[PDB]
Design a protein around this ligand. Sequence first.
Ligand SMILES: NC(=O)c1ccc[n+]([C@@H]2O[C@H](COP(=O)([O-])OP(=O)(O)OC[C@H]3O[C@@H](n4cnc5c(N)ncnc54)[C@H](OP(=O)(O)O)[C@@H]3O)[C@@H](O)[C@H]2O)c1
Ligand SMILES: NC(=O)c1ccc[n+]([C@@H]2O[C@H](COP(=O)([O-])OP(=O)(O)OC[C@H]3O[C@@H](n4cnc5c(N)ncnc54)[C@H](OP(=O)(O)O)[C@@H]3O)[C@@H](O)[C@H]2O)c1
Ligand SMILES: [Cl-]
Ligand SMILES: [Cl-]
Ligand SMILES: [Cl-]
Ligand SMILES: [K+]
Ligand SMILES: [K+]
Ligand SMILES: [K+]
Ligand SMILES: [K+]
Ligand SMILES: [K+]
Ligand SMILES: [K+]
Ligand SMILES: [K+]
Ligand SMILES: [K+]
Ligand SMILES: [K+]
Ligand SMILES: [K+]
Ligand SMILES: [K+]
Ligand SMILES: [K+]
Ligand SMILES: [Mg+2]
Ligand SMILES: [Mg+2]
Ligand SMILES: [Mg+2]
Ligand SMILES: [Mg+2]
Ligand SMILES: [Mg+2]
Ligand SMILES: [Mg+2]
Lengths: 308, 308
Amino acid sequence: MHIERLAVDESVGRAMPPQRFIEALSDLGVPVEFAGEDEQFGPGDAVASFGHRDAFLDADWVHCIRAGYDEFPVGVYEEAGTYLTNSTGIHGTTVGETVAGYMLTFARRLHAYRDAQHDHAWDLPRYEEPFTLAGERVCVVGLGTLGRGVVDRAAALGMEVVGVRRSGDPVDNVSTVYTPDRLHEAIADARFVVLATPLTDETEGMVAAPEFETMREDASLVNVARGPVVVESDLVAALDSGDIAGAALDVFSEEPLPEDSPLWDFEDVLITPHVSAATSKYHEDVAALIRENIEKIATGDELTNRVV
Amino acid sequence: MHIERLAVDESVGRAMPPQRFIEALSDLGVPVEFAGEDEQFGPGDAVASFGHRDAFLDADWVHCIRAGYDEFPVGVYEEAGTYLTNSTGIHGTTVGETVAGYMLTFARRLHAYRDAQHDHAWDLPRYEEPFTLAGERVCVVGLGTLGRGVVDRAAALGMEVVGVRRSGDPVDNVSTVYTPDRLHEAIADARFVVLATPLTDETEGMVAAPEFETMREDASLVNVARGPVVVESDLVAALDSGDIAGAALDVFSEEPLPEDSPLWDFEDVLITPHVSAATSKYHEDVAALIRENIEKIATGDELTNRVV
Ligand SMILES: NC(=O)c1ccc[n+]([C@@H]2O[C@H](COP(=O)([O-])OP(=O)(O)OC[C@H]3O[C@@H](n4cnc5c(N)ncnc54)[C@H](OP(=O)(O)O)[C@@H]3O)[C@@H](O)[C@H]2O)c1
Ligand SMILES: NC(=O)c1ccc[n+]([C@@H]2O[C@H](COP(=O)([O-])OP(=O)(O)OC[C@H]3O[C@@H](n4cnc5c(N)ncnc54)[C@H](OP(=O)(O)O)[C@@H]3O)[C@@H](O)[C@H]2O)c1
Ligand SMILES: [Cl-]
Ligand SMILES: [Cl-]
Ligand SMILES: [Cl-]
Ligand SMILES: [K+]
Ligand SMILES: [K+]
Ligand SMILES: [K+]
Ligand SMILES: [K+]
Ligand SMILES: [K+]
Ligand SMILES: [K+]
Ligand SMILES: [K+]
Ligand SMILES: [K+]
Ligand SMILES: [K+]
Ligand SMILES: [K+]
Ligand SMILES: [K+]
Ligand SMILES: [K+]
Ligand SMILES: [Mg+2]
Ligand SMILES: [Mg+2]
Ligand SMILES: [Mg+2]
Ligand SMILES: [Mg+2]
Ligand SMILES: [Mg+2]
Ligand SMILES: [Mg+2]
């Protein structure tokens, strides 16, 4: 399979300016070209894209610039003979730092202080409100690149770390790992529950009213995975009733989050606009994977992060 | 010395409910009692207090429940034969976590997102705005309990750490230690400059217009020390002119921060109301110091954290 061109789909703009990425891929050994949204593809084309387009099935290879490839019809790629790769492996530091930032925000009450800053108010916390992450329990659901980025930072901060993954097998810096049919055992005693799984048939709606019942009333949910891993209306109901204390949410069942969502209005909810993995160097981070896979395809080696 | 009672001055309420601290010391080996602000003291009395009262000079021992004793008349304690101890040693985790929180808030843009949350606005950052702490440089000025709490967390997050202390001697997790006469060299290339010194003769007004000139235009100041280590009007001017990018400020020249201060209104300033060390377990953390010095008094050993 003989790549002659890398097309950079305009949808990459949802993560990074296309020209920054195109410039990062100079010296690839094939030309790199911008592709607008209604262009055609053919043999010899590789495409780098955020979203899926059916026109891509005329190309030889699509590199999805996201870790999560849930919006791509994987079955149709195989039939068309188009390779599909993803960008898992590059988001550990960005998302790990954002999640550490969410947990420290809640522990040290930074968000409440920011609210007060708008009012020029010197509002002192109640004695019980500020706490330390050190000594507190976090459950990380999904123990891959994202989850491990969270775990390693949580462990370094002195948290007790448990988690969940498909295999249930051990992970460094996780004291106890559970399979997904022991999720309720994993989350029950945690001060924070972090979601870092792909969106699949299995994970869709994982976290719903039963899970919020099981969680501690003083616990917070962190979702940096995909919105539909949570049943969003159940999350709203749990927040309304005080079944849990709050949440840090980067992803939602409808994005952008509608202006009329109830989720904006809770003091102890942090909303971030699907930017937990944002970075001014995303173009370099993704370019490294493209260079790697170009070499693999050129030499007949197995592609890195091949989905189908 | 021979202690028969610990009085808990009501001013401890500026950090912790007095009854919580009294009850935490129910097995100390001497009785512990609430003291109101106009009580008198005598031989055998120890007193725990946030601030100084002249009535305490009739006691044998005052434990200041703060690390910083700059509002105590140290001179006069020696004359009265009253021992004075402070609470340095107990704020590393709380302040370390807060400062990691500030830094992660700036890197990951969480404060901007909080502001947008109030407006129900899905506001995407500029491409260049989000970055990672990993790989960025922090200079920690003061390498004691606070400063080491910052250092260790910064280092674990992948930062390059340099710092400043009086002795110049190496410190674990600091790549390069400078003496205070090389402050300008220490700060010049740092993305974050963190202040963690006591307020002394030498430290007052350390950070003023010339230091803001020296610092990078993209850098942020963190002050968790004392407000007067900074020349506050010079900080405002520096922020206005874009000499530095922003600041996380827990302490100020005048506290509470006056409502007319320009500091409240900068997007890239975080105001917190002298709470970087706040904790729902402060009672336990201070109690541990009392228990340690009661053992020292009983055995005739030197007191821990003795100021005079
Ligand atoms: N918010 C953002 O900007 C952002 C950025 C990047 C990624 N994401 C999302 O995060 C997802 C994960 O990315 P990643 O790079 O960390 O993926 P990854 O490295 O493939 O890790 C996935 C992890 O999920 C586990 N898992 C799968 N099904 C599970 C289940 N039912 N319950 C519990 N754990 C389960 C896997 O278990 P095993 O270890 O046993 O295989 C693995 O530990 C992506 O698919 C994407 O949706 C979000
Ligand atoms: N915001 C808050 O709520 C909060 C909480 C606790 C403390 N504080 C403030 O923080 C201060 C430090 O507390 P701590 O427990 O960390 O004290 P500490 O353990 O005694 O450490 C003080 C450090 O400052 C260094 N130092 C002294 N003069 C300096 C100078 N001119 N330039 C640079 N470094 C200098 C000392 O250097 P050497 O090691 O070489 O002697 C030491 O490393 C307290 O005095 C208090 O004012 C604030
Ligand atoms: Cl949903
Ligand atoms: Cl109480
Ligand atoms: Cl000043
Ligand atoms: K094809
Ligand atoms: K991975
Ligand atoms: K383990
Ligand atoms: K619950
Ligand atoms: K429960
Ligand atoms: K007790
Ligand atoms: K005395
Ligand atoms: K100390
Ligand atoms: K060192
Ligand atoms: K000066
Ligand atoms: K400057
Ligand atoms: K400069
Ligand atoms: Mg409140
Ligand atoms: Mg269920
Ligand atoms: Mg609202
Ligand atoms: Mg090879
Ligand atoms: Mg100077
Ligand atoms: Mg204002």
